Amino acid sequence: ETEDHLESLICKVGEKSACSLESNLEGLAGVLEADLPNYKSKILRLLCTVARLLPEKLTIYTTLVGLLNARNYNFGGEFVEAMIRQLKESLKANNYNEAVYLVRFLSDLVNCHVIAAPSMVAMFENFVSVTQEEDVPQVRRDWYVYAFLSSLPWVGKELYEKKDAEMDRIFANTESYLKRRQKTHVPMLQVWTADKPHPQEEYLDCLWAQIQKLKKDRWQERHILRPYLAFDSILCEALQHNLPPFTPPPHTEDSVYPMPRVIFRMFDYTDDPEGPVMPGSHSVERFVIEENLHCIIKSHWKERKTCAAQLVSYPGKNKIPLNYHIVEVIFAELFQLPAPPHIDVMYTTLLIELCKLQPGSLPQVLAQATEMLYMRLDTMNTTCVDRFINWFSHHLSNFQFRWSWEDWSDCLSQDPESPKPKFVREVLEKCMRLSYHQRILDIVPPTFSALCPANPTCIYKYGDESSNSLPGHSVALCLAVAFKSKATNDEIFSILKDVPNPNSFNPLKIEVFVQTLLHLAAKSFSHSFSALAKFHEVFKTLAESDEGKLHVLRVMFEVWRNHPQMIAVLVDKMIRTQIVDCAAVANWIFSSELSRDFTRLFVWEILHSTIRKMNKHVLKIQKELEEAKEKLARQHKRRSDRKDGVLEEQIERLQEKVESAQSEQKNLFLVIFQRFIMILTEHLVRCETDGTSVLTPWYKNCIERLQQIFLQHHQIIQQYMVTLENLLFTAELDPHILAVFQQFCALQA
Amino acid sequence: KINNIWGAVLQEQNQDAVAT
């Protein structure tokens, strides 16, 4: 009860209260001082926890520490020792986000007269000197400089007015380092490749510019809340502590550092001619606002209602257009590469809740943002485009599919493959997936009918009278009647063993059997699932060869080439039921039969779903092997303190299974990359021979899909890096394709 | 021109919810 009471007290401070923040801080300080002699370690741990897991209230939690230090020097010293221990553990653990929040806490604790400025200056000197280390990854240096620069907006004035000489030396070293950094990764991370109206500059470059503007402004931001300013009278006399000499942990092979990111900028002060002047793109206030909003979203990503409530009630020293900032931060998280911090549907639901909470103003801002995003579609990345399409379709579904389509009439005259008409087509198709064709037709203007999708109806090649001359029509009719008569598998073999092979793989046989089966089971998903599961044996016996699986996939596409969702679901079931392996589907995606539909979003959602299925299967088998090994170890230790033989045998079998699963995963990724390389190389050679522009919508889509696969599965491709560089991505490769691989390598190096 | 289509949609949905 004591611990939970202390936790509730500490967390409560700064929320809805009838009293001011200073009064709450003083009360909490007193209370803690009362409970100091009996819960010193408990309080220390709780404070280090709120410091490490609640960055969005950072300054508040430092003022508390600034008061306790004024009351108990010993307590302050122990606290800073514990904070340096937590920092060293987070660094040895590879928890660099927590480590940077801790560094920010120490930096702002320097402002409360807890930590002496010279000691923090020395720590920052060590941080910067990390940049002078030899043969270390550039991500380490990047992060160590980032920590310092990100902490500067909170203690920069103090550090400069105390040690301006060493501060200038630090700044000179930081500039010398930043001038020689590598920016190879920026193109793979920019949401928009266009340099106007908002360049998507790297986070370190942005932050450096902001710090330079803050220094030119005599270190004055007018945004950050500093409750300890009102306590100056009590804090000036308080004794200051000296941090022990800090040496960053040495680089190790197993250490993993955060990958560089690119600031997502889409708004401008001109976009709100009525509200408060939005902070400039290079103002430190803007960076602090985005960081606080990101932390708020990351701290409440489970409770969408509470997340919306916290976002809407975000405090600031000076009034700002908080609606625009929230929308921008939400879109930045949604459109962030490689992947968003959380599932993509969370952002949609959070935006819906935000609109519900503030219907008077926010919906207009959302519509304006949508229109902006659409106007700048000519360069947005296709991954961000897919995320935008999904979110917008879900939004329209949640708002009676109402939108001012006429405002986008400019897209009706453009090439249908242009990002704008393509985006409209995909949005309409997704809206249809959540509705019926007729409704989608009824809602769009008639002039947009050329974009509306196609009715999702089965295409039975042997249904029309003109099909009587097709080979296998009689066999098709016999199979149809047998299916209608609940025939058994052996009967179906008897009716099928009479199909004339065109020349252990009969294409006509598979084609007829699958066309008939799908056609008779083409009134509901459940029907198809039952027809696939019941006749599983026939499927596995007719499609023994990988070529047979490819033929099955091709026939399934031909039957349902108008119902992409059905195609997707069917392929999923076929790969889970083991009718087709993932390699066959991967080969099918790049097959010529999909060239006309190669750029359509459903083929890539299918490919990604198959990759995810393979990854999950491998992870499950590995986890089972780990559990079996743990059980073996526990049993052996308990016995030491037949069965063993058979268990060890099992373990061996599981290990072989894990090896085979990893081999299949590797083969899947290798085949995918080979097919990407082949298509891009042949396209580039043909374009060069023709002397035409290499930048075409198809090329952009393919290259950015390759980038999407690399970004999505870097975690696994890190293992194959060696073979990828030795076999696939070689020097002889075309520079355009090799550029993607170089960017991916530089992403974490 | 402030596109307020979704403000109208939210107003209609709230009216329907009140009617229900």
Binding site: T49, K302, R304, M346, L434, S526, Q565 | -
Partner: protein, 151 residues
């Protein structure tokens, strides 16, 4: 360790609905619910086909199986479904984000379920449909019309 305020997960908590025809005590039903992967999706329209339900619920993760709520005698939809995901995390995400989202302009309401057994897909209502459909009196086009009692 970790702050309990952040651990608050109000959307992934058990509801007050306990199965009335379950074969066992309440305790084992709760045990199953804490590890189940099946969600009962209610407040659906009769016309809602399962393709759109799959398209909506496949946004939280890979779906394993979908069972539509058939009528006891007419064998037609009654406005409820069972969605069985492949992993617990996917079901939790669906409850945290899909719960309370519109579908066919209808506010769907997903809840945890103790799993699927044969005969559960038929509405317990003695009229064939759903008990709520038998007790409600307000008109609803998506739910056929007036309640069975009204007719």
């Amino acid at each position: 360790g970790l702050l309990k305020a952040l651990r608050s997960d109000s959307y992934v908590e058990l509801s007050q609905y306990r199965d009335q025809h379950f074969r066992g005590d309440n305790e084992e039903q709760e045990k199953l619910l804490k590890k189940s992967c099946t969600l009962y999706v209610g407040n659906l329209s009769f016309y809602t086909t399962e393709e759109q339900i799959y398209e909506l619920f496949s946004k939280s993760g890979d779906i394993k199986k979908i069972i539509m709520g058939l009528d006891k005698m007419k064998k037609t939809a009654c406005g409820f479904c069972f969605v069985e995901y492949y992993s617990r995390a996917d079901a939790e995400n669906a409850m945290r984000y899909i719960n309370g989202t519109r579908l066919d302009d209808r506010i769907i309401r997903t809840d945890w379920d103790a799993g699927f057994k044969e005969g559960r897909q038929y509405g317990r209502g003695r009229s064939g449909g759903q008990v709520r459909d038998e007790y409600r009196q307000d008109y609803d086009a998506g739910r056929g019309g007036y309640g069975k009692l009204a007719q």
